[PDB]
Design a protein around this nucleic acid. Structure first.
Ligand SMILES: [Mg+2]
Ligand SMILES: [Mg+2]
Ligand SMILES: [Mg+2]
Ligand SMILES: [Mg+2]
Ligand SMILES: [Mg+2]
Length: 132
RNA sequence: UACUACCCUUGUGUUAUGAACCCUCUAACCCGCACCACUAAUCGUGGUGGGAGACAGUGUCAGAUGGGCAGUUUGACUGGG
């Protein structure tokens, strides 16, 4: 019950803090990056989509290719591996995800591109962050 | 299908805000209401009560009405016109 309470909903944890406490907030569980976007998810020009390997078709099918694709809700969220993975390796996984998602930008975006941003797991409560 | 969150439509609430509308207040404005003083003054200015009251009045802007008023128009040909 109290795993939903221990997490500091007020604070924007760093990537490192987030992946570290993701190990705790499980009571096994796949960690999950989540963006809520400023784009229009209901138009073809902004249907963000793709797939990328977690380093932590053997290069794709076996190496741990996780797919990302934004839903109609504007919420694109992707697995980045289990809580039993090393936390700096989770930082590397999120580096992969964040870099590829930011560099896959629809050029017609607005002043803000990420409305909200957070982490969860298969039993992870929300861990909101501020892109750093 | 459990459960975690990213959440999305729909409609309930708290709070902060913005408008419209009704009532209530009085402290602005007003009283060809009373009393006091200036003061011998049916003026006026103040003071004290009472009444109305953020209306009215006044200013600006706009719409309707407007011979009450004003300025003007109201052809030529043509066996007169
Ligand atoms: Mg009279
Ligand atoms: Mg006339
Ligand atoms: Mg003249
Ligand atoms: Mg004539
Ligand atoms: Mg004639």
């Amino acid at each position: 019950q109290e795993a939903l309470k221990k997490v500091d909903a007020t604070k924007a944890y760093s990537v490192e803090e987030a992946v570290a406490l993701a190990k705790d907030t499980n009571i096994d569980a796949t960690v999950e990056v989540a963006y809520k976007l400023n784009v229009d998810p209901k138009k073809a020009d902004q249907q963000i989509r793709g797939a990328v390997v977690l380093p932590n078709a053997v290069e794709e099918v076996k190496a741990g290719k996780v797919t990302y694709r934004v839903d109609k809700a504007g919420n694109i969220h992707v697995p980045i591996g289990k809580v039993s993975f090393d936390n700096e390796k989770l930082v590397e996984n999120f580096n992969t995800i964040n870099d590829v998602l930011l560099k896959a930008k629809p050029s017609t975006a607005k002043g803000q591109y990420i409305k909200n941003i957070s982490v969860t797991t298969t039993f992870g409560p929300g861990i909101h962050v501020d892109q750093a």
